[PDB]
Amino acid sequence: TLGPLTRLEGIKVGHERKVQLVTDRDHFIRTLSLKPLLFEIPGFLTDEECRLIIHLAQMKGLQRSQILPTEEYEEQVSQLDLFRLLDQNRDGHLQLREVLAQTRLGNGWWMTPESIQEMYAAIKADPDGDGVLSLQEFSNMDLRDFHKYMRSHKAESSELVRNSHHTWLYQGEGAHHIMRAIRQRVLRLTRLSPEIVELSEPLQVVRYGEGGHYHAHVDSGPVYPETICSHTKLVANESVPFETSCRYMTVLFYLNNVTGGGETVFPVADNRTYDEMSLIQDDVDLRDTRRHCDKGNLRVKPQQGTAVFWYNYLPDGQGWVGDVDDYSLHGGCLVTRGTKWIANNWINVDPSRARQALFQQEMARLAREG
Amino acid sequence: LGPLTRLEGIKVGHERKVQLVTDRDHFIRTLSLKPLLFEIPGFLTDEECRLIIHLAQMKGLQRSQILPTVSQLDLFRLLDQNRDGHLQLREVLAQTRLGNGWWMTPESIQEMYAAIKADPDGDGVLSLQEFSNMDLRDFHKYMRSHKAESSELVRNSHHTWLYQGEGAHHIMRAIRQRVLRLTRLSPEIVELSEPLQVVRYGEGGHYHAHVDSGPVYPETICSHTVPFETSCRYMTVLFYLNNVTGGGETVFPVADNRTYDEMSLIQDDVDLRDTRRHCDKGNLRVKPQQGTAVFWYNYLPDGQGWVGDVDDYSLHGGCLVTRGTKWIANNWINVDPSRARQALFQQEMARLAREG
Ligand SMILES: *[C@@H]1O[C@H](CO)[C@@H](O[C@@H]2O[C@H](CO)[C@@H](O[C@@H]3O[C@H](CO[C@H]4O[C@H](CO[C@H]5O[C@H](CO)[C@@H](O)[C@H](O)[C@@H]5O[C@H]5O[C@H](CO)[C@@H](O)[C@H](O)[C@@H]5O)[C@@H](O)[C@H](O[C@H]5O[C@H](CO)[C@@H](O)[C@H](O)[C@@H]5O)[C@@H]4O)[C@@H](O)[C@H](O[C@H]4O[C@H](CO)[C@@H](O)[C@H](O)[C@@H]4O[C@H]4O[C@H](CO)[C@@H](O)[C@H](O)[C@@H]4O[C@@H]4O[C@H](CO)[C@@H](O)[C@H](O)[C@@H]4O)[C@@H]3O)[C@H](O)[C@H]2NC(C)=O)[C@H](O)[C@H]1NC(C)=O
Ligand SMILES: *[C@@H]1O[C@H](CO)[C@@H](O[C@@H]2O[C@H](CO)[C@@H](O[C@@H]3O[C@H](CO[C@H]4O[C@H](CO[C@H]5O[C@H](CO)[C@@H](O)[C@H](O)[C@@H]5O[C@H]5O[C@H](CO)[C@@H](O)[C@H](O)[C@@H]5O)[C@@H](O)[C@H](O[C@H]5O[C@H](CO)[C@@H](O)[C@H](O)[C@@H]5O)[C@@H]4O)[C@@H](O)[C@H](O[C@H]4O[C@H](CO)[C@@H](O)[C@H](O)[C@@H]4O[C@H]4O[C@H](CO)[C@@H](O)[C@H](O)[C@@H]4O[C@H]4O[C@H](CO)[C@@H](O)[C@H](O)[C@@H]4O)[C@@H]3O)[C@H](O)[C@H]2NC(C)=O)[C@H](O)[C@H]1NC(C)=O
Ligand SMILES: *[C@@H]1O[C@H](CO)[C@@H](O[C@@H]2O[C@H](CO)[C@@H](O)[C@H](O)[C@H]2NC(C)=O)[C@H](O)[C@H]1NC(C)=O
Ligand SMILES: *[C@@H]1O[C@H](CO)[C@@H](O[C@@H]2O[C@H](CO)[C@@H](O)[C@H](O)[C@H]2NC(C)=O)[C@H](O)[C@H]1NC(C)=O
Ligand SMILES: O=C(O)CNC(=O)C(=O)O
Ligand SMILES: O=C(O)CNC(=O)C(=O)O
Ligand SMILES: [Ca+2]
Ligand SMILES: [Ca+2]
Ligand SMILES: [Ca+2]
Ligand SMILES: [Ca+2]
Ligand SMILES: [Cl-]
Ligand SMILES: [Cl-]
Ligand SMILES: [Fe+2]
Ligand SMILES: [Fe+2]
């Protein structure tokens, strides 16, 4: 028993409220959407603090955000059971949008209509070349040929799901006083318990170079009664079943002005319904943030010092964490000129209140013991 | 040996019939005279483009460019090309070798200035004051620590090589013979030049504008024949292996331009060598068409039938691919600018054929 989780009311799109986060000046929280519940705070960071974060990130050294895949995907399905899973509309034919909807099949590579049809042509999977695999065409191909194509596929990071470099910065005791003042500022903003905030993932600093992108995704995975949160798991490192990120909130800081592109897109923000049938189509995949940013419902233009933040889950009706909010779908749009620097604070809450409770009060046990 | 046959462009748009296979007719169309640039539609069948792609895929492609690992007043006056006591952005951009494999942009230079705080006033210009209040260590370690994407490199693609000599696939050397009849050159020169290069440009790939051969000095050595070793490619023959859904043109930024002037080529706001940003501003673009071959001369004549200086107008690059993939193959014809070296080289190679 920890008490109800604070969830800020969006009230309506465009609602601005004064908030006091620093004694010096006033800040203003603007509601950008309700689905997902998404806010914006101009000037959350000073120009000096942005430049400090970048420099601390550069001094540590960045690494490729996503490893270049070397293989096909692995997870027990017979070939036809895979067909039945892919054929959403059950017409005996795999349309491009149905293949596109299973991006995990790319095993890290981002699939496009062109990349799919180029693979079809290489392994001769589509004899009549219409972009559709009928049941006969699907059953007529040896999946070993598909595997061999994935094993030898050589492509650039612009063909990945995630195309950026990043690192992490500590914010607890023993860190630069500015890095710790920022954590206290996030704590004062989200009005969550100090335990929750100071136990979440360290600050991630991301550099998008000219040409970088991050196709649209959600920050936290589904909630089953057996899913396991990495932040709450006793073992420092594992490759367990059901491991997932349990990020209650995402706080995103724009560390610089971007000369061209680089927006954050929420493709279905405040859309009346959420329908993957129109999200992913043969001609337009709204998750592609290299091609179709301009068609998403809402974009946030990077502005130095601005923080945007949003909840990744719905409420559950009792003050804790509900299902994931499908509308929190978001990506990093293609950077056309210059580099884009951002930082994100993820607030971790286990969807099981009892499991989170055992993680907090024992993380305090070890501070006393150690 | 005999004088190198150099085809006559006549005028832009001039089209002449040529017979390279006995099946059909080909047509050589002049695209420009500076550089001397031709286009032949349907040079390759749709089946041979599919075979070249299929062959390269099996061999496996490698990343085309690997990511990188005197005084200051010697350096300042060497870059201050207009001698105005300032380093304009265009003057830093003019020396891409300083990027050491990274492509420099106005935004990347100004990003680096602010990192090491070289520009207090932030106007983008490095005064002599600002440039000596500098210290080259910091700049060196900025390049030390710089990690960036392949889209920030000069060359952003993957490639491999396919052999065309004896024992190779019968379709392959049939292309080599077709190239020979097209160029009207000595079988010694063609069959002793580099193997065919197959390049894959992924979506988001590019190759910034460059020339295919280094300058001519009495002390340069051709790799096909290490102090100042450079590539001596007399001709470049480029094959388009697929239709490209978006972008991926070959740009010749200064084709048939009245003069060649790097002051207008590289400016503070527009670098015409940048094939990610400014392809639409170049003089001439070739749209990839499956089967089409384009070819051009990288050197000027010398007036005596051999190889002159580099043709600056041959500057060219691969434009950003916006949708899909772009596959091309290119044949490089190597000729030694010193005819004496080229003569001894192919006559000696004749030894190891009849000796073997
Ligand atoms: C592809 O091919 C094209 C064509 O070949 C080529 O373009 C040429 O590029 C050059 C480089 O960019 C251009 O060079 C300019 O020219 C300006 C002057 O501009 C004009 O005059 C041209 C010549 O005019 C005459 O002759 C014609 C016949 O040839 C005739 O028809 C005309 O009527 C005109 O006639 C008169 O003058 C004659 C004497 O010249 C006389 O005999 C006659 O009786 C009559 O009185 C003219 O052709 C131009 O017209 C074109 O261009 C403009 C602008 O592009 C168009 O709008 C227009 O429609 C025309 O198409 C134009 O009218 C020079 O001032 C300039 O020199 C500056 O820059 C160079 C850099 O190269 C420096 O070396 C030089 O020192 C000087 O520097 C200053 O200025 C620059 C910024 O401009 C700064 O960077 C410097 O720091 C310096 O700064 C200054 O600071 C001072 C104070 O501190 C201050 O005092 C200064 O004002 C300034 O602020 C340079 O030479 C050339 O014009 C282009 N030619 C054409 C035809 O376009 C491309 O470059 C090629 N592409 C590539 C990639 O190579
Ligand atoms: C963000 O939010 C958006 C809004 O919520 C959301 O958009 C919604 O998207 C879905 C899915 O993309 C759309 O669903 C489609 O609707 C089509 C019908 O289109 C018309 O009708 C609807 C509903 O209309 C009535 O009701 C309202 C009130 O509710 C009234 O105001 C209207 O006047 C209208 O009135 C009458 O009808 C009522 C009964 O329905 C009566 O009660 C009443 O009295 C009236 O008589 C309208 O809203 C539509 O308007 C929109 O579009 C038109 C232009 O098209 C605009 O002018 C207009 O302004 C609106 O913007 C429209 O008029 C269905 O046909 C369609 O069904 C097919 O596809 C789905 C999946 O996509 C399948 O489940 C389904 O089985 C159908 O399958 C076929 O067709 C596809 C298409 O090719 C095939 O690929 C497929 O294989 C299948 O094939 C078969 O049929 C084909 C022909 O049908 C044939 O060619 C084949 O050969 C094969 O045989 C689908 O249900 C929905 O309309 C959108 N709503 C709106 C408001 O836009 C969006 O998705 C959200 N975004 C994201 C990312 O989630
Ligand atoms: C980044 O861009 C913003 C947007 O223009 C700049 O903000 C402007 O000017 C003052 C200067 O601090 C700010 O208080 C305003 O909020 C901004 N103007 C508007 C209209 O919003 C900001 O200065 C830029 N930062 C850098 C480092 O270039
Ligand atoms: C690649 O594109 C070219 C040009 O769009 C296609 O060529 C045309 O070929 C058809 C016959 O198949 C002619 O009817 C058109 O007139 C041609 N157009 C031009 C501009 O020459 C070519 O078929 C395409 N190849 C592939 C494999 O898609
Ligand atoms: O880079 C952007 O604008 C989008 N950011 C993210 O998806 C993230 O790192 O959580
Ligand atoms: O990609 C293109 O069209 C340009 N190609 C080249 O510059 C080359 O490989 O020599
Ligand atoms: Ca189907
Ligand atoms: Ca088919
Ligand atoms: Ca200068
Ligand atoms: Ca300055
Ligand atoms: Cl509300
Ligand atoms: Cl890469
Ligand atoms: Fe994200
Ligand atoms: Fe080239």
Q: Which of B53, B142, B149 has the highest number of chain A CBs within 10 A, making it the mutation to test binding with A? A: B149
Rounded-to-integer distance, Cα A208 and Cα A290, Å: 13
- Start-to-end CA distance of chain A, whole Å, equals 25
The answer to whether B133 touches A192, Cβ cutoff 8 Å, is: no
Rounded-to-integer distance, Cα B279 and Cα B283, Å: 9
Rounded-to-integer distance, Cα B150 and Cα B102, Å: 9
The verdict on whether residue B224 carries a ligand-binding annotation is no
Phi first, then psi, for residue B96 (nearest 5°) are -70, -20
Using the mean position of ligand 8's atoms as its centre, give its distance from the Cα of residue A131 in Å.
Answer: 6
DSSP state of B155: E
A22: Cα within 13 Å, side-chain hemisphere: 15
Q: Is B175 helix (H, G, I), strand (E, B) or coil?
A: helix
Q: Which residues surround ligand 1 with Cβ inside 6 Å?
A: B 82, 84, 254, 257-261, 263-265
Identify the sign of the CA torsion A246, A198, A64, A207: positive
Close Cβ partners of A152 (under 8 Å, ≥ 6 residues apart): B57, B58, B60
A337-359: burial string, b at 16+ Cβ within 10 Å, e else: bbbbbbbbbbbbbbbbbeebeeb
Rounded-to-integer distance, Cα B110 and Cα B130, Å: 14
DSSP state of B239: E
Phi first, then psi, for residue A115 (nearest 5°) are -65, -35
H or E element, residue B208: strand B206-210
Say if the Cβ atoms of B115 and A212 lie within 8 Å: no
How far apart, in Å, are the Cα atoms of A365 and each of A192, A195, A358? 21, 13, 10
Q: Is B297 helix (H, G, I), strand (E, B) or coil?
A: strand
The answer to whether A186 touches A174, Cβ cutoff 8 Å, is: no
Cβ neighbours of B128 (radius 10 Å) = 16
The answer to whether B242 touches B53, Cβ cutoff 8 Å, is: yes
How many A/B residue pairs have CB atoms within 8 Å? 99
Residue B239: strand pairing partners:
B293, B329
Domain residues of chain B, as ranges? 15-63+153-354, 72-147
DSSP B322-343: EES-EEEEEEEEE--SSHHHHH
Last residue before each break in chain A (C–N > 2.5 Å): 75
Rounded-to-integer distance, Cα A296 and Cα A287, Å: 9
Tokens of B159: 């490639």
Residue A89: strand pairing partners:
none
- Is some CB atom of chain A closer than 8 A to the CB atom of B150? yes
Q: To what resolution in angstroms was this structure determined?
A: 2.2
Phi first, then psi, for residue A256 (nearest 5°) are -160, 165
Instruction: Please tell me which of the candidates B149, B324, B325 has its beta carbon nearest to residue A211.
Output: B149
Say if the Cβ atoms of B323 and A112 lie within 8 Å: yes
Say if the Cβ atoms of A157 and B149 lie within 8 Å: yes
How far apart, in Å, are the Cα atoms of B92 and each of A290, B96, B108, B208? 30, 8, 11, 17
Close Cβ partners of A55 (under 8 Å, ≥ 6 residues apart): B115
The second-level CATH assignment, the architecture, of A16-66+160-369 is Sandwich (2.60)
Closest listed residue to residue B204, CA positions, set B254, B258, B262, B246: B246
Closest listed residue to residue B68, CA positions, set B3, B130, B133, B145: B145
Tokens of B100: 């050491």
User: Minimal Cα–Cα distance from A182 to chain B, Å?
Assistant: 22
* Residue in chain A nearest B61 by alpha carbon: A154
* Residue in chain A nearest B153 by alpha carbon: A210
| CATH number assigned to the domain with residue range B72-147, chosen from the 4 options 1.10.238.10, 1.10.940.10, 3.30.2080.10, 2.30.40.10 | 1.10.238.10
Closest listed residue to residue B136, CA positions, set B69, B92, B75: B75
The answer to whether A40 touches A308, Cβ cutoff 8 Å, is: yes
The verdict on whether residue A340 carries a ligand-binding annotation is yes
Q: Tokens 């990945």 identify what position?
A: A160
From start to end of B250-348, where are the E strands? 250-252, 284-286, 293-297, 299-301, 307-310, 316-318, 321-323, 326-334
Q: Which residues surround ligand 5 with Cβ inside 6 Å?
A: A 206, 214, 219, 250, 252, 264, 330, 332, 342, 344
The identity of residue A19, as a single letter, is: V
The answer to whether B202 touches A156, Cβ cutoff 8 Å, is: yes
B127 lines ligand 4 (CB under 6 A): no
Q: Tokens 């060649």 identify what position?
A: B260
Q: What is the 3-state secondary structure (H, E, C) of chain A?
A: CCCCCCCCCCCCCCCEEEECCCCCCCEEEEEEECCCCEEEECCCCCHHHHHHHHHHHHHHCCEECCCCCCCCCCCCCCHHHHHHHHCCCCCCEECHHHHHCCHHHHECECCCHHHHHHHHHHCCCCCCCCCCEEHHHHHCCCHHHHHHHHHHCCCCHHHECEECEEEEECCCCCCCHHHHHHHHHHHHHHCCCHHHHHCCCCEEEEEECCCCEEEEECCCCCCCCCCEECCCCCCCCCCCCCEECCEEEEEEEECCCCCEECCEEECCCCCCCCCHHHHECCCCECCCCCCCHHHCCEEECCCCCCEEEEECEEECCCCCEEEECHHHCEEECCEEECCEEEEEEEEECCCCHHHHHHHHHHHHHHHHHC
Closest listed residue to residue A234, CA positions, set A347, A353, A355, A348: A355
Q: What is the 3-state secondary structure (H, E, C) of A80-99?
A: HHHHHHHCCCCCCEECHHHH
- Is some CB atom of chain A closer than 8 A to the CB atom of B208? no
Residue A63: strand pairing partners:
A166
Instruction: Please tell me which of the candidates B107, B147, B205 has its beta carbon nearest to residue A337.
Output: B107
Q: Tokens 């004896």 identify what position?
A: B166
Close Cβ partners of B161 (under 8 Å, ≥ 6 residues apart): B194, B195, B196, B197, B198
Q: Tokens 């089209």 identify what position?
A: B15
The identity of residue B354, as a single letter, is: R
Using the mean position of ligand 14's atoms as its centre, give its distance from the Cα of residue B180 in Å.
Answer: 20
Close Cβ partners of B260 (under 8 Å, ≥ 6 residues apart): B254, B312, B313
Report whether the peptide linkage leading into residue B301 is cis, meaning its omega lies within 30 degrees of zero.
no
A138: Cα within 13 Å, side-chain hemisphere: 20
The verdict on whether residue B212 carries a ligand-binding annotation is yes
Rounded-to-integer distance, Cα A55 and Cα B341, Å: 54
Say if the Cβ atoms of B149 and A61 lie within 8 Å: no
* Residue in chain B nearest A57 by alpha carbon: B145
The answer to whether B196 touches B162, Cβ cutoff 8 Å, is: yes
DSSP B65-129: SPPP---HHHHHHHH-TT-SSEE-HHHHHT-GGGGTTBPP-HHHHHHHHHHHT--SS-SS-EEHH
Close Cβ partners of A178 (under 8 Å, ≥ 6 residues apart): A48, A49, A52
Experimental method: X-ray
- Is some CB atom of chain B closer than 8 A to the CB atom of A131? no
DSSP state of B22: S
Closest listed residue to residue A255, CA positions, set A191, A167, A157: A167
Which of A32, A206, A328, A340 has most ligand 5 atoms within 8 Å of CB, for mutation? A206
Closest listed residue to residue B184, CA positions, set B295, B339, B286: B295
Rounded-to-integer distance, Cα A45 and Cα A28, Å: 13
How distant is the alpha carbon of residue A257 from its chain centre?
21
Tokens of B150: 């392949």
Rounded-to-integer distance, Cα A7 and Cα A315, Å: 8
Tokens of A43: 């000037």
Close Cβ partners of B352 (under 8 Å, ≥ 6 residues apart): none
Q: In what order do the strands lie in the sheet with A27-33?
A: A16-19, A27-33, A38-41, A307-311, A247-254, A340-348, A203-208, A165-169, A63-64
Q: Is B202 helix (H, G, I), strand (E, B) or coil?
A: coil
The answer to whether A352 touches A233, Cβ cutoff 8 Å, is: no
With vertex at residue A98, the alpha carbon angle to CA A93 and CA A103, rounded to the nearest 5 degrees, is 140
The answer to whether B43 touches B179, Cβ cutoff 8 Å, is: no
Closest listed residue to residue B320, CA positions, set B270, B354, B355, B274: B274
Shortest-distance ligand to the CA of residue B290: 4
DSSP B38-80: EEETTSS-HHHHHHHHHHHHHH--EESSPPP---HHHHHHHH-
Hey, what CATH class is A79-154 in? mainly alpha
Q: Is B228 helix (H, G, I), strand (E, B) or coil?
A: coil
Say if the Cβ atoms of B152 and A61 lie within 8 Å: no
DSSP state of B195: P
The identity of residue A205, as a single letter, is: V
Using the mean position of ligand 14's atoms as its centre, give its distance from the Cα of residue B42 in Å.
Answer: 21
- Superfamily of segment(s) B15-63+153-354: q2cbj1_9rhob like domain (2.60.120.620)
Close Cβ partners of A220 (under 8 Å, ≥ 6 residues apart): A244, A245, A246, A247, A248, A312, A313, A324
The answer to whether B233 touches B216, Cβ cutoff 8 Å, is: no
Rounded-to-integer distance, Cα A63 and Cα A71, Å: 21
- Start-to-end CA distance of chain B, whole Å, equals 24
Residues within 5 Å of ion ligand 9, judged at the Cβ atom: B 80, 82, 84, 86, 88
